[PDB]
Structures are given as structure tokens and as C-alpha cells.
From a paper:
Here we report crystal structures of assembled HIV-1 CA hexamers with peptides comprising the linear binding epitopes of NUP153 and CPSF6 and the two antiviral compounds PF74 and BI-2. To attempt to explain how these diverse phenotypes are achieved, we carried out interaction studies using a CA that can be assembled into stable hexamers through the formation of engineered disulfide bonds at the NTD-NTD intrahexameric interface. The structures reveal that the binding pocket identified for CPSF6 in CA NTD is actually part of a much larger protein-protein interface that also accommodates NUP153 and is present only in assembled CA. The complete binding site is formed by NTD helices 3 and 4 of one CA monomer (referred to as the ‘first site’) and NTD helices 2 and 7 and CTD helices 8 and 9 from an adjacent monomer (referred to as the ‘second site’).
To understand how CPSF6 and NUP153 interact with hexameric CA we determined X-ray crystal structures with the same peptide ligands used in the ITC studies. Crystals of each complex were obtained in two different spacegroups, hexagonal (P6) and orthorhombic (P212121), similar to those reported for the uncomplexed CA hexamer. The cofactor interface incorporates a structurally dynamic region involving CTD helices 8 and 9 that was observed to adopt two distinct conformations in the orthorhombic crystal structure of the uncomplexed hexamer. Comparison to CPSF6 and NUP153 complexes solved in the same orthorhombic form reveals that these cofactors selectively bind to one of these conformations, which we have termed ‘open’. In the ‘open’ conformation, helices 8 and 9 are of equal length and separated by a single residue. Binding of CPSF6 and NUP153 to hexamer in the ‘closed’ conformation is prevented by steric clashes with loop. A consequence of cofactor binding may therefore be to alter capsid conformational dynamics and drive equilibrium towards an ‘open’ conformation at the CTD-CTD or hexamer-hexamer interface. Within one monomer, CPSF6 interacts with N53, L56, N57, M66, Q67, L69, K70, I73, N74, A77, S102, A105, G106, T107, T108 and Y130. Outside of the phenylalanine binding pocket, the two ligands form distinct interactions with hexameric capsid. Both cofactors make interactions across neighbouring hexamers but while CPSF6 contacts the CTD of the second monomer, NUP153 interacts predominantly with the NTD. The ligands diverge after the shared phenylalanine, with CPSF6 residues 315–319 intercalating between helices 4 and 9 in neighbouring monomers and making contacts with residues Y169, L172, R173, Q179, K182, N183 and T186, including hydrogen bonds with Q179 and K182.
Residue numbers in the entry:
A (entry chain B): 1 to 85, 96 to 176, 186 to 220
B (entry chain C), E (entry chain E): 1 to 85, 99 to 176, 186 to 220
C (entry chain A): 1 to 86, 99 to 220
D (entry chain D): 1 to 86, 95 to 176, 186 to 220
F (entry chain F): 1 to 84, 97 to 176, 178 to 220
G (entry chain O), H (entry chain P), J (entry chain Q), K (entry chain M), L (entry chain R): 313 to 326
I (entry chain N): 313 to 325
Write the structure that this text describes.
Amino acid sequence: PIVQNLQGQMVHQCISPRTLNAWVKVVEEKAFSPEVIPMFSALSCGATPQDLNTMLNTVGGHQAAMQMLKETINEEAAEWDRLHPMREPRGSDIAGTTSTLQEQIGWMTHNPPIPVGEIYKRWIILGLNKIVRMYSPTSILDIRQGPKEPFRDYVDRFYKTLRAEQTETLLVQNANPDCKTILKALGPGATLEEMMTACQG
Amino acid sequence: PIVQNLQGQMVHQCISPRTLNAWVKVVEEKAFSPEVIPMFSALSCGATPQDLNTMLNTVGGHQAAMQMLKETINEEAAEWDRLHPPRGSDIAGTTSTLQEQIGWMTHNPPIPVGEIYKRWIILGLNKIVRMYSPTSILDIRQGPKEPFRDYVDRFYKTLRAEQTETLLVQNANPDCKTILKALGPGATLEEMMTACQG
Amino acid sequence: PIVQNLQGQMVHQCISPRTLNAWVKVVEEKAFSPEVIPMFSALSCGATPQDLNTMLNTVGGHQAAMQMLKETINEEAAEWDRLHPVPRGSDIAGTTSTLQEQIGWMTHNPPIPVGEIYKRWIILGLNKIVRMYSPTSILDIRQGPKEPFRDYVDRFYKTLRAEQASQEVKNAATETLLVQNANPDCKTILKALGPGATLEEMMTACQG
Amino acid sequence: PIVQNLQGQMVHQCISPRTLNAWVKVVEEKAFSPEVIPMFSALSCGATPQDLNTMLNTVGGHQAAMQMLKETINEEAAEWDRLHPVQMREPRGSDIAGTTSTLQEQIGWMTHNPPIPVGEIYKRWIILGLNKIVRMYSPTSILDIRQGPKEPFRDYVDRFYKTLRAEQTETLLVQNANPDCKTILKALGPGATLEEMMTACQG
Amino acid sequence: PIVQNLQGQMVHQCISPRTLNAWVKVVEEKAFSPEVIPMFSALSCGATPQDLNTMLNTVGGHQAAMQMLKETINEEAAEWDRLHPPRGSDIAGTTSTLQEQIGWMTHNPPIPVGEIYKRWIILGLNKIVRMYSPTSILDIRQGPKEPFRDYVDRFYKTLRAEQTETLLVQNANPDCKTILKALGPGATLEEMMTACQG
Amino acid sequence: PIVQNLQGQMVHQCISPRTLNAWVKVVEEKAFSPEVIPMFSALSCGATPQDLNTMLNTVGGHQAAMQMLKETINEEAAEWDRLHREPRGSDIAGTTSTLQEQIGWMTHNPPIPVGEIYKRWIILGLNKIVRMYSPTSILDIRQGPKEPFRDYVDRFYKTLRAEQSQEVKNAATETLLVQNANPDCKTILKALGPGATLEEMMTACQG
Amino acid sequence: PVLFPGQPFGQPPL
Amino acid sequence: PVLFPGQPFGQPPL
Amino acid sequence: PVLFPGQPFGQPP
Amino acid sequence: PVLFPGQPFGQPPL
Amino acid sequence: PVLFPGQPFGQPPL
Amino acid sequence: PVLFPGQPFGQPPL
């Protein structure tokens, strides 16, 4: 990535072993849960397009997702080329296929800058959101409270599903008879704290 | 976060893998016990609103808790807009850029939007700790063969999550209660625990 | 490797225990899966020819592969000597050159990045090894009776990556061979969707 | 904590994830054994009062001990206020504890010339409170440590000085040894080193 | 410990978590094998007397050894007091402050109280390794079907803890003993081990 | 070890806990396989004689090997004394020299890199130990009846690596690899001929 | 409000 | 006193 | 397109 | 003596 | 060639 | 010799 130093200047650094390992391990462990995306964005802080490509290429397995991610990058690159017919970067130059590390640093450290790293990261995060959407096992409609399931555990499963898919009516309607009766007896506009406190005992 | 350097200047750093991982693991292990809050505060030292959002977003699961946290942020953000006609959304980091957040924080005088947003988050986390607290202080009573040390640990652990002079001694078992009342009022916890040791 | 410092100058540093271990462990765990190469490239960022040799020499086992890799370096070094009749091919490989000479060439103005040239040869040799060691052919990847489409597609593109044939063959394999080798339930749904559909659309269709 | 840098200046740094986790794990594993205190002191090297509070607050459970710790702090803070009644404002007991002082004032005092090390003063109170807790939580008395029938002397001596460390020698160590070793130790005579005693009761 | 910085000046630094943990874990895993001493010396590189005491006090258990260590420190401290009418107790860190310790260590000419105290500690640890050595060199003899390599490992491992020409060859088994004596005196260990391979 | 800093000056640093542990663990796990040597060399980058002694001394067990290593150091130290403040053989080994003197020689202009010279002796000793501890000779490596060629070649060059002369190893490789293959693959490799690359040979004996 | 359900912390509106 | 029972360490009073 | 099916990230045309 | 049985290392006297 | 079979990577000749 | 059998590495003689 490109970061500051003691002298207060933007300079290129090699990607660290910690960051390389962290990203490989989070994908191995969490696959494509919603929380992988913010972890990717944080681990790719100040990254060049080269660095992003390295991070994506270090992923073994999940090649369905990586292929979906390529198609998203293509769609965003094609849109950039349409809207953008100092030499300004093409879509391929942002994706790091037709641009050198010198050129990428050149754009990112220019005044005014063209942050090709942050633009390419935007396309990648956009593709990762679609993959999380896909890899979401359950639909929001199928999340319903069990016979002896606590309300806390039900709400956890509801919003976890909702996060991956992406509230007022569906949350209360799919609760069990005992809690549903209490939740409708609290009325509309109640906070989630008030609802959970009501269905505790 | 924003931190000092060799030259003695406030500059932006990328949030570290160590910090990211530390927060993910403490949530995975401790869920929302009282001690999770001070650990969050420490791990988010000098954090920007962007950094605070990153830390919250990295939490997998507990989405009931995280939704209650959002609703708290909305309430405090709405309250900020009322008192200040940086907006509430700018402090939360939805409508503001990293450059603006660093701008406010490193300004002279500084507007610490990171610390204000952290205050909202910690306020929201305290509510979640309240909710997720299982036992009431009134239900904590010393067992038959339970050492007094163990009973006191359960008492103040419950008291910490909920939020003494009368309730601690009154709920103790017969043997210890007799000794504690015999010691009299204004006795230190050290003296009380030493008295009910054997 | 050679990296920048506080003053902003290109200076030599020792290869870190973290880097040494990371490379040893990735080879131990992943052998010669396609993803080992970009890890090698990243872990060897700013590396001198000496550092590249260090990393390769730390690999225990896999000596057939390391011998194949040596022969690739020999082929590329001979070509370099052919195209450059006066850094020799042997100087880029770090046999006949010292660390001081390697740092000299790399930090010169204009520079001759012998570390990057040698890495290019090493990566070219590692790719040949990955091809050799690929177990399955793309023609043998076919969706199981009760295998989810996601898992089938994963195996397909994982295999396609390791085979690494020409772009025309990869495009042709993906267009016709992916759908043709899917199971009847999904196959009917994919052909019903029509050609030119994105992978997202295909996988969303065969989810349930 | 407050530490030096490249330029050689005392500056504030955020407490590290390593230091935070190290302190949480040592309490989880060692509870309040004697060796927890020197680990706390080392991990809190150069710490501000804020940092000391952060470390104490990160401890889950052991709230009987933390309450006993809070009471010890109150006694030492009360003693500070007595000895120090009423450039920057002179620190009260509550300022040293980090309840009524800001981080800026804490850094101010610690990096002043001459300095007022509020971090070290507050640590002294905490370590004094932790010693009392180690005293309390010590399971066995020194009088109850006696060598078993087939227990080696080395293992016995370990248990002796382990118990002695938590409670806080010449007569009690030899007298509570088993008959076979006791005869050999008394035969060696007084003023013999522990090395000579342990060598004698090896076989 | 006291180390250099960017400016090139000897300055105090806090002992790190890594170093603290590394010393705790090596004592837990290896107890007092000969190799624990060189690891202590390396982990206490540039250490002040305070740091050395910190490392020793962090050890839980092995209090028999720690007590033996104290008695060694006393003997060496008394000997220093005799030879120097910085006292012995100041080098041990009992009667000296960190500032005074740093003063002596960074003085010109320096008085390395860290190294002097480490020398006493290492001298005490060597005695503890002597004590805790299970086997004598006389008892180490090659088994019936034991390879010569494994025998020589047990020989020199034992020799290291206790602390060669005649004892090594004479305690080998019949088949190897005949070959080693046939090779003659003044032969290298490599030649000896190559001889008793098959 | 001795390393550079921000100011760009060769200064001494304490050996790190990471490096200490890394060396302890590689010897614990890999013992004395060929690949332990380049790891030792890398982990001891810019090391002083004292650091090298620290690393060797931290090794528990393997004392037969460490003794052979001492004997090699003695021979090389004696050789140095014969061929040659001015450093003696014992000064390079770190017995009769202080850290002050070692830093002196290493940061001198012109420098006498006693750390690198002492590493050369240790590596030369470690090579002998790898030779010793090598279980199989290259002559005894022969392709099994149903052993894949890839596995056979792995064993051949693993053994060859531990055996270590360049003129011999080349002659061994050229003739011995093909000659010790099984009948079916051997016919194919000889048909393919001399000067064929290992890639071509392994491809030819795949099926 | 600032944050909506099932969206990330810091999601910009519109 | 400085710290009341139950309140966290470094808790500002009032 | 920038990336054809199955080609590495950053792979030039 | 500098260190007495039972007391920690670097413990001040008296 | 630069590297003969059996020799370590980067090993000098002669 | 420089190193004797038994004594550690970097051990001064006598």
C-alpha cells in the first residue's frame, strides 16, 4: 500500500506477511459472511490496485465467487470507460491489468489525486456484496421463531439473514404465539430493546 | 486511528490487523459481558468514526445487539441535530469523508467526532449489557456449602451488569451472616471475607 | 529485501522470521496449488536474488519441482545471455553476484531490478510446476447428484485455474462445458435462462 | 502509556492489543497467584492512571477482589489527601486514581519538570491492594505443608516456598519433612544451604 | 532494558509482552534444562536489574530453585561488598531505583549493573541445572539394539547438565566397542559415528 | 545482530524473541534436514559471533551433532590461526572476544566480518551433520514396481541434496537417475535421450 | 435516521 | 471516597 | 472485458 | 543478606 | 548452465 | 582446541 512516513510523505510499502496471512485466514474461516467485507476493506487500507489483485489472487478455493467478482469488475470497468471516453486511467488501468505499479502510484499521489486503489476497491466491495447475497443460505421469509426458542436467539437469526440479503411487519409476524401476543400488545413504534425485554420471561 | 509520530504530529494510520482481530475475538469469546466495553474503548483508542464503523462491521452475528446499537446511534444523532442546528450523520461517519473526520479531529480547537461517536456507541453497548444480564441482584444468595469468596464474586458481578450495604449480608447463609452482623457495620470487605473464611 | 526508511532511502534489510516461516508453511500446507505463486510474489516483495534463493532453499521436499525450477532458470538465463552480450544470467540468479553487486544494480540510476527479473524467471517456473501437478482435467468435472451448484462451480473454476490453458480454451470451456456438465435439475433451469447470462444469475437460479 | 521515541521525547501512546490481551489472559489462567503482580507491574510499565484503570476494567469476574482493590485505593487516596492538602494544579487522591483527572492532566504531571509520577503512585496503591488479595486467596497455610510418605524432597520444597510466598523457614522446613529425610537434614547440621539439603535428600 | 534508538542514544524501554511471555513459557515447557540459561541470557539482553527481577518474579512455581537462586545472589552480593567497600544490594535491585540503575549503565565509563547481576543469576541457574540433572555420566551406556547416534546424544546431553575420551568408547555396546577401538585413539566423533552406523 | 537504522548507521541490536524461538522450533521440528541450514543462515542475518553462539546454545538435545559442530569449529579455527586489534581463530568463535571487539571488527573500515566467517564454519559443520544424518545413499534410491515417477524423482533429489561434489552430483544425476528407474519408464527415458529436460522426462513417464 | 436495518454501519444515504 | 462500590475504575462521580 | 473467465487478477491482455 | 526466604526479588530491606 | 542438479539455489560455481 | 567437549559455545577457557 501507499502510506505516510516520518518525513510526512506518501511512499509505497510492500504488503506485510501479517496482512497477507490475515486475509487468507479470514476467508478460510468465515468464507463469505457479511463481516468479511469490512475486514477486507480494513486489511486493504491505502492499497494499490496491484495490492488488491495480490490479496484476491492469494485466495485458494472459492473460485465461483472470484469468477463472479471478475464479472462485476468488468461491468464497473465498462461503465467507467463509457463515462470517461495528465492521462486519465482506463477501466483496465484501474483494475491493474494494463497499468504498472509506477503508474498506479502516479495517479494516487498526484495533486489532485485520482485514487485508482479506492475506485478499484469500490468495484471489488460491490462484487463481494453480491457474493454475500448469493452465499446467504436462508431467505428472510423463512426465518420464524421456534416452539421453545428464546426471542433473543430468534432476533439474532433474523437480522443476520437480513444483513446478508441486503423489518417492521415481518419480525413480529414470524414470532411464536406467546411472544407475538405480547409484541402486538406493546404496539407499533416500540424499540427493539422494549420488544426483547417483553419476550424475556 | 489518529496518532503521534517521531516528528510529534497527529497523523492518520491504518487500523492494524492486531486491533481488528483482538476486537473480533473478544466479542466471539465474551459476547457482551461488562468487560467487553472497556476493551472496546481501549482497542478504539484515537479511532476515527470510519475506524469505529469498521470495528462494529467486523462483528459477525449478535445482530440483535447490533440493531439495538444502531437505534441508539440514531437517537443520539437526532439529539445532536436538535442541540446543533458537523451533523449527527457526519459524526456517525455516513455523510462525512475520512478527510473531513481527520479535519475536525486535528482542528484547533478540535472537534473530536471520534470520541463523540464512541460515547454514543459505549452508551448503546451499556444498554445491551443491561439486556443480556441474566440474574437480578435480589436473586443472588449464598449457597449451603458455597464459600463466601465465591458468593461475593457472584454478587458484585451481577451488580456490575445491573448498574450493597444491606443486601450483601442479608442474603448470606446463616453461619456467615451471624459472624458478619457480629463484626458490626462499617466493616471492610477484607474484614468480612476474612471472618467467613473458615 | 531492499526497502525505504524514515529518511526515504533504499536500504537493505534482512529477511524477517515472519516472511521465512510464512513461505515455508504455505508450501507445506498448499504444496503447488495456483495460489502459492501470488503468495510467493507478495512474500518476496522487494527481494534481492539472494533473498529469492534463500526462500527457495528453505523448502524441504518437493525436489522434483525444485529441479524443474532450476532448469527453467537455466533456460531463461541462457536467453538473457543471448540477448545481452555485454549483469550476466548467472548474476541475476545470484550465483556469480554478491549481495553488494545486487544492491548496486537494484539501487542504480537508472536501475536494473535483478530481483524482479529473477522473480519473473522463478514465477515462470512455478507456473510450469502448477500445470504439471494439477490432478484433474476440466472434462472430468461434473456436478454430482446431490451436490450444490455453488460447490460444483467452485471445483470447475479451481480446476480451470490449475490447468491454465489458453484464453480461447478457458472462454470455450466456461461457455459450453460448465452448463453441459451440470446435473439435470439445474441444467434445465440454466438453458431456460438463455445464453449471455451472468454467473450470479446462473447460481441464483440453481440455489433451490 | 508514556514512552520515548526516535527524537527522544516523552509522548503518549495508545495501549497495545498485545498488552491488553496479555493482562486478560494472565488473570484468566493464574487468577491471583503471587506471580500475577510482577506481570501486572511489567505490563503497566509507563502506564498513565487511565491505562491502569483500563487494565483493571478489562478483567471479567474476580469482582470480590476488584472491590477489595477499590477499598484499598480509597484508603491510600484518603492518606494522600491528608498528607497533601490545599505550572499546573497539585494532584489530589482522586486525580491520581484517574476519576477526577483528564488524560491531558495525567500526561502533564508525568512529563513535568520536575515530574509527579501519578501513574507510578497509583500503581503502588494497586500493587499494595493486589498483595492483600494474594494474601486472602492463598489456599494453604505454611503450617499445613508437610512432606508425604513417598513424595520427593524437591516437590515438597516447591510446595513449601510456593505457600510461603503467598502467605507473606529455618526450623519449619526441616521439622515438617518426612522421617527418612529429616534424619539426614538434622545430621547435616544448622547453617547448611538449601542446595546441600536437597542434594542430601535426593536418593 | 536499555537500547539504542534512531538518534543513536542509550535510552530505557519497557520490557515487552513478547519477552515476558517467552520467559514464562520456556520455564513452563523446559523447566531447567541446560538450554534454558542461554535463552534467559538472550531474552534479558540489555536488561536492567529491575528487568531481571521482573523476569524472575514472573516465574510461578519452581520456588525451590528460586530460593536456591536467592542464596547464590546473596553469596555473590556479599563478595561484591567485600571487594567494593553501587553496593551488592544495589546491583540486585533491592536498594536501587530504576533511575540510578540507568545512571550507572549509561555512565561514562559505564558500570553495567545489569550484566553483573545477570552474571550472578546465570551462576545460580547453572547450579540449579546441576541439581536437576537426573542421570550421571557413569550411568549412560549404550543399549543392546540402541543406535550409536542415540547413545551419543544421551551421553553429551548428560555431560552438558553435569558440567569423554575413555568413558564414551568404554560404555558402548560390544559390537560398536570393537569397531571404535579398532579405529584407534585420536579419531573424530564423525569417524566414530560413521563406523557404528551399520 | 548488527543492522542499519533511520540515520543509516550500523548499530547493534539485541536478538529478538521471534528469531530465538524460530530457530528453536525449526530444529525441534526438522532436526537436521538439508533445509535447516538455509533457515539458520537467514535467521542469523547480520549476526555477531555472540548471537551465533546464543542460537547454537539454545538448542536442547541433538548434542551429538553439536559436538561434531564444535570439532569442525576447532579445525577451522586452527586453520585460521595457521594462515594468520587483529582477530585470532578463538576471537572469531566468540570465546576470547567481547561484544565490543566483535562490533569493532564488523563495523571497521575496512571491515573484518567475524560474524560471517564464523557462520561459514558453522554452516560447514552443519553440512557434515546433514551428510551423517542422511539415512539413504543415492545409489540405494531406485524406483519401485508401482511407484510414480514423480515420487521417485522427489526421493532421488532429496537424497542427493543431503549427500551433497558438483562434478559427481552432475554425473550421478545424468546417468544414475535414469538407470535406477523401473523397466517401463527406463525404456521411455532412454528413448527420449540425453539432454532431455526433467519436465519432459516426468511427462513421458506420467501414464 | 442515520442507520437503517440490515445495512452496514457508515452506509451513505441515497 | 474516590471509588464507590459497583461503579467502574476511573468513573467520574456526580 | 478487462478480465476474461479464468484469468488471474492483474493479468495483462 | 540481600534477599530473604519468601520475599520477592528486588524487595527493599527492613 | 547456471544451476547444476543437486546444488543449492544461488550457490557459486568453482 | 577452542571448544572442549561438554562446555558451551562461546565459553572462555580456563
